[PDB]
Write an enzyme that holds these catalytic residues in place. Structure first.
Site, PDB file in Angstrom:
ATOM      1  N   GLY A  14      77.532  21.537 -13.661  1.00 52.53           N
ATOM      2  CA  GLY A  14      75.895  21.340 -12.960  1.00 52.53           C
ATOM      3  C   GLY A  14      76.212  22.774 -11.388  1.00 52.53           C
ATOM      4  O   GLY A  14      75.142  23.659 -11.717  1.00 52.53           O
ATOM      5  N   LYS A  15      77.083  22.702 -10.902  1.00 48.73           N
ATOM      6  CA  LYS A  15      76.841  24.536 -10.243  1.00 48.73           C
ATOM      7  C   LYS A  15      77.048  25.802 -11.018  1.00 48.73           C
ATOM      8  O   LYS A  15      76.992  26.480 -11.014  1.00 48.73           O
ATOM      9  CB  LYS A  15      78.489  24.071  -8.884  1.00 48.73           C
ATOM     10  N   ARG A  32      85.776  18.102 -20.887  1.00 53.79           N
ATOM     11  CA  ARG A  32      84.294  18.174 -19.798  1.00 53.79           C
ATOM     12  C   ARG A  32      83.899  19.505 -19.835  1.00 53.79           C
ATOM     13  O   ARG A  32      82.948  19.809 -19.974  1.00 53.79           O
ATOM     14  CB  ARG A  32      85.400  17.880 -18.013  1.00 53.79           C
ATOM     15  N   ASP A  92      94.743  26.095 -16.146  1.00 58.01           N
ATOM     16  CA  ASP A  92      94.431  25.913 -15.071  1.00 58.01           C
ATOM     17  C   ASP A  92      95.013  26.975 -13.804  1.00 58.01           C
ATOM     18  O   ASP A  92      95.684  27.663 -13.697  1.00 58.01           O
ATOM     19  CB  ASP A  92      96.649  25.401 -14.119  1.00 58.01           C
ATOM     20  N   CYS A 110      83.359  16.531  -3.547  1.00 55.15           N
ATOM     21  CA  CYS A 110      82.752  15.723  -3.401  1.00 55.15           C
ATOM     22  C   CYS A 110      83.263  13.582  -2.202  1.00 55.15           C
ATOM     23  O   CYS A 110      82.731  13.007  -2.638  1.00 55.15           O
ATOM     24  CB  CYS A 110      81.828  14.867  -4.457  1.00 55.15           C
TER      25      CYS A 110
HETATM   26  C1  LIG Z   1      84.746  18.046  -8.565  1.00 55.00           C
HETATM   27  S1  LIG Z   1      85.136  18.339 -10.713  1.00 55.00           S
HETATM   28  C2  LIG Z   1      83.569  19.823 -11.252  1.00 55.00           C
HETATM   29  C3  LIG Z   1      82.183  19.479 -11.085  1.00 55.00           C
HETATM   30  C4  LIG Z   1      81.476  21.034 -11.332  1.00 55.00           C
HETATM   31  N1  LIG Z   1      81.800  21.693 -10.536  1.00 55.00           N
HETATM   32  C5  LIG Z   1      80.094  20.415 -11.117  1.00 55.00           C
HETATM   33  O1  LIG Z   1      79.353  21.192 -10.639  1.00 55.00           O
HETATM   34  O2  LIG Z   1      80.062  19.824 -12.614  1.00 55.00           O
HETATM   35  C6  LIG Z   1      86.459  18.613 -10.674  1.00 55.00           C
HETATM   36  C7  LIG Z   1      87.054  19.192 -12.001  1.00 55.00           C
HETATM   37  O3  LIG Z   1      88.310  20.560 -11.499  1.00 55.00           O
HETATM   38  C8  LIG Z   1      89.096  20.319 -12.873  1.00 55.00           C
HETATM   39  N2  LIG Z   1      90.787  20.174 -12.770  1.00 55.00           N
HETATM   40  C9  LIG Z   1      91.733  19.288 -11.901  1.00 55.00           C
HETATM   41  N3  LIG Z   1      92.055  19.653 -12.661  1.00 55.00           N
HETATM   42  C10 LIG Z   1      92.346  21.465 -11.837  1.00 55.00           C
HETATM   43  C11 LIG Z   1      93.137  22.817 -12.532  1.00 55.00           C
HETATM   44  N4  LIG Z   1      94.097  22.133 -12.501  1.00 55.00           N
HETATM   45  N5  LIG Z   1      92.514  23.916 -12.721  1.00 55.00           N
HETATM   46  C12 LIG Z   1      91.288  23.723 -13.025  1.00 55.00           C
HETATM   47  N6  LIG Z   1      90.652  22.611 -12.910  1.00 55.00           N
HETATM   48  C13 LIG Z   1      90.685  21.564 -12.275  1.00 55.00           C
HETATM   49  C14 LIG Z   1      88.770  18.658 -13.598  1.00 55.00           C
HETATM   50  O4  LIG Z   1      88.892  19.135 -15.057  1.00 55.00           O
HETATM   51  C15 LIG Z   1      86.938  18.785 -12.782  1.00 55.00           C
HETATM   52  O5  LIG Z   1      86.237  19.049 -13.810  1.00 55.00           O
END
Ligand SMILES: C[S@@+](CC[C@H](N)C(=O)[O-])C[C@H]1O[C@@H](n2cnc3c(N)ncnc32)[C@H](O)[C@@H]1O
Lengths: 342, 233
Positions: A144-145, A167, A195, A268
């Protein structure tokens, strides 16, 4: 015993403390239908689509806020200096609970608009993209962002990253539905599943603008979706270590930022342990471990101009927080802008 | 023979010439106030409800006296039965099956008691005009989802309120975190508001003192809740 119930119990204990008399109004909103905004696709027939949305009685809350930028009697700078440009997002009036129809492809074969929590657009707006910017979305999926960043037309390059390959497949679907095969399949966009914590070693000092929208207790979703709920007994360790992960991600985002560049951290969640505390933790980590100075930027004027659309929790130490309210059931959305000074 | 009338009428309660002149204004005009006399009380209320739906005069005494023995058997005697005829005059003119079906629904579908049923009948005359089964669901909402047991369901005049009013105010409180369903043995961590402070008071008072939110927030909620209901049902 349902994870959805452990979430509510956890929120009741922590957020009645954080918010006091304000908690019930937020609570009822978290437990009722979320309000949406329609982000117009600037790659579609944006003017036409904007007119159709207006005919529904919705209004572009971005244009409305921006038109009041130099009101409030002052602004630190013109709106165009402070906000990412070209974003049109329509919402119905406060108290109006109407839904937008689902978007369909238009003449150019791309989706006309993207339905989202209107609050989600604020960290993108606050990031202040400007033409020619090299931009990193560190935790990008489902996108989305990312989509909003691209819509600004300001990303000379956009790195969209997310640790989860699945995702990221959703993000790719969105780019294919919204963005012509020209921008998405060019030199402009690089999509990775790395990561985000490693970014300082991968691309240190590289980005003009970094968005760090971290994994978090995702408060609203956690109250509604039982499956793979962060409050499941099976994920308790994972849940409790979240602020450590969030600090590591923000720190990496900052390390990836050019000296002088800017970062927006967002979550969020309503929780100060994931919000202000993480901002403070990352800044301290950068000072102590890297001798890098990071300055929190004041979004007060930004908040005030958007108060016509969103309810905010005004006593945030650093950063800003959109809170759910029945008149404007957006968020929770925490966001904090900062600049890497050295 | 105004003597053969006003003797019995003035010996009984007729305050001024008043409603007697109104009675002339409106042999059946005497055999009915007697049935009401036996029902009991209502010396001034009899005039009040004679003014409200004068149809009782048109009512045949064979049918009326049958209706009076009927209500007395339900426990509406000793009369009063006061608010009942005031807000539900239809009770003496409606189909008997209505009344009996309501009784047969309260009793033994919802259980309660002959005394509890008589109490509800006296306090919540609405229940006779309300769809059966809608009535059952409303009891069920009180008992199963609100966790109110029978004596409080009657003590508070719960069954008098529309199910929409109940759901709107109760679910609002629940999502605000201000109403908790009694656990087992009926314990909540926080006492809950009095049922009267939820359902009896005006909306403005409810929102000011119990829900503790603005009125505009509640109006939006009502719209949100109505859509939720339409969309699952
Ligand atoms: C709140 S969501 C992002 C929503 C996205 N920015 C949007 O607006 O649609 C947080 C994301 O962090 C990812 N994530 C978790 N640990 C991570 C890591 N170590 N490095 C990069 N991404 C990670 C998850 O896969 C998840 O999709």
């Amino acid at each position: 015993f349902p994870a959805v119930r452990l979430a509510l119990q956890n929120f009741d204990m922590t957020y009645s403390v954080q918010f006091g008399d304000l908690w019930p109004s937020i609570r009822v909103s978290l437990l009722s239908e979320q309000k949406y905004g329609a982000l117009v696709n600037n790659f579609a027939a944006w003017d036409h689509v904007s007119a159709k949305l207006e005919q529904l009685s919705a209004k572009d809350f971005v244009n409305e806020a921006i038109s009041h930028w130099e009101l409030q009697s002052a602004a630190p700078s013109p709106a165009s200096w402070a906000c990412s440009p070209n974003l049109r997002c329509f919402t119905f009036d406060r108290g109006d609970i109407s839904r937008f129809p689902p978007a369909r492809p238009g003449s150019l074969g791309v989706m006309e608009y993207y339905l989202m929590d209107a609050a989600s657009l604020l960290p993108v707006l606050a990031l202040g993209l400007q033409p020619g910017d090299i931009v990193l979305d560190l935790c990008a999926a489902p996108g989305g962002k990312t989509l909003a960043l691209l819509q600004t037309g300001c990303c000379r390059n956009l790195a969209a990253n997310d640790l989860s390959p699945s995702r990221i497949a959703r993000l790719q679907k969105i780019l294919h539905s919204y963005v012509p095969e020209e921008i998405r399949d060019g030199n402009q966009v690089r999509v990775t599943s790395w990561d985000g914590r490693k970014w300082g070693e991968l691309e240190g000092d590289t980005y003009d603008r970094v968005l760090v929208d971290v994994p978090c207790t995702t408060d609203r979703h956690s109250l509604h979706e039982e499956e793979n709920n962060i409050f499941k007994r099976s994920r308790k360790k994972e849940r409790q270590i979240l602020p450590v992960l969030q600090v590591q991600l923000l720190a990496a985002g900052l390390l990836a930022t050019k000296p002088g560049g800017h970062v927006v951290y967002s979550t969020c969640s309503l929780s100060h342990l994931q919000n202000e505390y993480v901002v403070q933790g990352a800044i301290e980590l950068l000072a102590n471990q890297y001798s890098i100075q990071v300055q929190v930027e004041d979004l007060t004027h930004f908040r005030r101009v958007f108060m016509d659309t969103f309810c905010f929790f005004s006593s945030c130490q650093v950063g800003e927080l959109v809170i759910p309210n029945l008149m404007a059931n957006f968020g929770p959305m925490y966001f904090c802008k900062m600049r890497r000074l050295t | 023979x105004x003597x053969x009338x006003x003797x019995x009428x003035x010996x009984x309660x007729x305050x001024x010439x008043x409603x007697x002149x109104x009675x002339x204004x409106x042999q059946q005009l005497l055999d009915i106030i007697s049935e009401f006399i036996l029902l009991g009380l209502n010396p001034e209320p009899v005039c009040v409800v004679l003014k409200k739906s004068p149809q009782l005069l048109k009512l045949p005494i064979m049918q009326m006296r049958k209706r009076s023995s009927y209500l007395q058997k339900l426990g509406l005697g000793e009369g009063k039965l006061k608010r009942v005829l005031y807000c539900c005059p239809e009770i003496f003119t409606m189909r008997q099956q209505d009344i009996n079906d309501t009784v047969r629904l309260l009793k033994e579908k919802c259980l309660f008691t002959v005394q509890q049923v008589t109490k509800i009948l006296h306090s919540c005359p609405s229940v006779l005009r309300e769809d059966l089964g809608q009535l059952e669901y409303k009891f069920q909402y009180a008992y199963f989802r609100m966790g109110i047991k029978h004596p409080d369901i009657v003590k508070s005049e719960y069954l008098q309120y529309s199910l929409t009013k109940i759901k709107q105010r109760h679910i609002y409180l629940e999502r605000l975190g201000r109403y908790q369903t009694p656990d087992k043995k009926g314990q909540t961590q926080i006492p809950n508001p009095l049922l009267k402070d939820i359902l009896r008071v005006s909306e403005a008072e409810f929102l000011a003192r119990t829900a503790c939110t603005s009125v505009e927030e509640f109006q939006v909620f009502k719209k949100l809740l109505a859509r939720e209901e339409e969309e699952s049902e």
